[PDB]
Design a protein that fits this description.
Length: about 575
């Protein structure tokens, strides 16, 4: 009995390595070269992996995991019993694969055109408009045009996708796809736990929101900003208003303090995408963590091809399940925002390398939020003024300190409500609370409730603004990012303590700390082998998610914001 189970998991492991490697290859070849041909081969590797999954999954279900002694084998088998989409009947599976492809392709190739003028892609053209334009109408053109072309085009697919992903979930024992996604945390209290964390971050977010609102009122005019209302969603420097640091220049706390736009210095000093990834590689090895293999530099796609290929630009990190081949696919622009993204992606690679010797079933983060957090933790240290000066991107006070904390808050704090709301919407869609008649309206009620944003153009029939955000057509869960943004501060706090930092958490730089590296490595090596609180304990010395570290980091800014907002009589929040 125990021996039949051990044999099954050995067979699953050897066979999955091969099939998954093949699938990954075909997926890569489509994502880096969208053609009718690579599309065909991919829809076919889809059948190969589904047949494997069905064969092994059917077998795994014949085991009574109740009767199994060995906890590693019990866990693998329990996981393999979940077939995901391979539980679907053939016709439904083919239909589902095709909608997924059609949605991701639609998003990745959408353009927004001036009439008898040029057509702009999201990366880089529209991204650059939203980051740099300070003209209401130009921002509006890009914000609305993107939703009209990408969002509206996804709407035709999305009800059918919901039906099929929910069907698959039920066939694997869940009540709907959102139940199956939440299950990845193995935490029955997840919903409650996440709300509590979100509530802890409200003082900070509301004070940041009010401060930024006031600054936007100063630039865009009184007739366009209601000081007691939501902020128009196209003014925050980002297509989704999910991060706000591109409007730092409008909101600087101490504009008299000498400053140097990082992005401008990178370009002035001839940085390239390769240099950006090498810098990240260097931070990892400085910690005693693993270097990316030679193969990574040969095979990765670190900038947008200029050779006529059409690609999925949206940055991602890829494991080919052979313990040797790891790659990033990103349409990298030379700027600080993408340096942070590069670190993020390099964290995923780091995780893949750390757990490469586990059985493939356990080759995941402790929970999905841990996978997202690793690269972000190193990027916190990278972003410090001291570290950017060491890279020759900054030439150099309480003034500079508050300025820095505001720059950081515009990314990290502004993202909290956005990252919370995405799957609050999708969970309700999947559980049937939001129908296709109310997709958009319910999105905007959440955008208002959590972020305090309004749409600058009233939405109409046929809009499907969630479709204009990559993870929606791509079927990538989002709550991981909310988790990540909380826990990355816990990890920074712990690692700073392990490295012997004293003084304010925000002045920590863990560059070259082997003590910090070792903490991270022990945790990453666990993969998915143990309940996530064990990885949390290895890093932090305690088992809980907690907002305390993020609050600690930002406390000097909280104080500064409260004093500033009070001085101007701001009314926090909106109706
Ligand atoms: C429950 O089952 C798990 C899984 O077992 C593994 O998979 C099964 C399907 C089957 O094929 C098993 O035969 C197979 O082991 C057991 O967990 C594994 O436990 C062993 C320990 O017996 C671990 O082995 C380690 O492997 C390292 C890398 O190859 C190796 O370097 C380690 O040794 C190090 O320590 C020695 C001490 O002598 C020292 O010389 C060095 O410091 C050296 O490097 C060590 O042998 C596996 O890694 C575990 N595998 C996984 C995937 O977790 C588990 O023990 C079992 N539970 C019970 C109660 O028996
Ligand atoms: C750029 C990044 N791309 C995602 C791709 C995820 C993915 C997953 C599965 C298949 C295809 C793509 C990731 O690396 O987690 C991303 O979407 N985000 C999120 C986002 O931009 O929405 C916020 C996260 C912090 C830094 C960058 C991270
Ligand atoms: C893109 O795919 C086409 C069709 O499969 C193939 O012939 C071509 O060589 C590919 N281009 C690159 C750069 O790989
Ligand atoms: Cl939107
Ligand atoms: Cl997730
Ligand atoms: Zn990620």
């Amino acid at each position: 009995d125990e021996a039949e189970a051990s044999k099954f998991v050995e067979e699953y492991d050897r066979t999955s390595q091969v099939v998954w490697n093949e699938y990954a290859g075909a997926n890569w070849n489509y994502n880096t070269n969208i053609t009718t041909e690579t599309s065909k081969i991919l829809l076919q590797k889809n059948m190969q992996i589904a047949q494997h999954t069905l064969k092994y999954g059917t077998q795994a279900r014949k085991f009574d995991v109740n009767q199994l002694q060995n906890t590693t084998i019990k866990r693998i088998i329990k996981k393999v019993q979940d077939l995901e989409r391979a539980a679907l009947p053939a016709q439904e599976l083919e239909e589902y694969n095709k909608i997924l492809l059609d949605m991701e392709t639609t998003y990745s190739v959408a353009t927004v055109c001036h009439p008898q003028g040029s057509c702009l892609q999201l990366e880089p053209d529209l991204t650059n408009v939203m980051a740099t334009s300070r003209k209401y109408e130009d921002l509006l053109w890009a914000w609305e045009g993107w939703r009209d072309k990408a969002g509206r085009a996804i709407l035709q697919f999305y009800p059918k996708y919901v039906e099929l992903i929910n069907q698959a979930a039920r066939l694997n024992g869940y009540v709907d796809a959102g139940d199956s996604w939440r299950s990845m945390y193995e935490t029955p209290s997840l919903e409650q736990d996440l709300e509590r964390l979100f509530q802890e971050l409200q003082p900070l977010y509301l004070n940041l929101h009010a401060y930024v609102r006031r600054a936007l009122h100063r630039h865009y005019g009184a007739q366009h900003i209601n000081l007691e209302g939501p902020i128009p969603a196209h003014l925050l420097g980002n297509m989704w208003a999910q991060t706000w640091s591109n409007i730092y220049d409008l909101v600087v706390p101490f504009p008299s303090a000498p400053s140097m736009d990082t992005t401008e210095a990178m370009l002035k000093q001839g940085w390239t995408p390769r240099r950006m990834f090498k810098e990240a590689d260097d931070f990892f090895t400085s910690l005693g963590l693993l270097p990316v293999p030679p193969e990574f530099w040969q095979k990765s796609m670190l900038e947008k091809p200029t050779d006529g290929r059409e690609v999925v630009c949206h940055a991602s990190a890829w494991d080919f399940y052979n313990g040797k081949d790891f790659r990033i696919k990103q349409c990298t622009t030379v700027n600080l925002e993408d340096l942070v993204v590069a670190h993020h992606e390099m964290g995923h690679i780091q995780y893949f390398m750390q757990y490469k010797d586990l059985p493939v079933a356990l080759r995941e983060g402790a929970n999905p939020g841990f996978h997202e957090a690793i690269g972000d933790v190193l990027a916190l240290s990278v972003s410090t003024p001291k570290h950017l000066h060491s890279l020759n991107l900054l030439s150099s006070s309480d003034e500079h300190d508050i300025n820095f904390l505001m720059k950081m808050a515009l990314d990290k704090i502004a993202f909290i409500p956005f990252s919370y709301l995405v799957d609050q919407w999708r969970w309700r869609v999947f559980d049937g609370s939001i129908t296709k008649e109310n997709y958009n309206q319910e999105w905007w009620s959440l955008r208002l409730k959590y972020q305090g944003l309004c749409p600058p153009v009233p939405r109409t029939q046929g809009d499907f603004d969630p479709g204009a955000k990559f993870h929606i057509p791509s079927s990538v869960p989002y709550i991981r990012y909310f988790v990540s943004f909380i826990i990355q501060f816990q990890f920074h706090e712990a690692l700073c303590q392990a490295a012997g930092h004293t003084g304010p958490l925000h002045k920590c730089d863990i560059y070259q700390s082997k003590e910090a590296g070792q903490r991270l490595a022990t945790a990453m090596k666990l993969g998915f082998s143990r309940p996530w609180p064990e990885a949390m304990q290895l890093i932090t010395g305690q088992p809980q998610m907690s907002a305390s570290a993020m609050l600690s980091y930002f406390k000097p800014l909280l104080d500064w914001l409260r004093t500033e907002n009070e001085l101007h009589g701001e009314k926090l929040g909106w109706p």
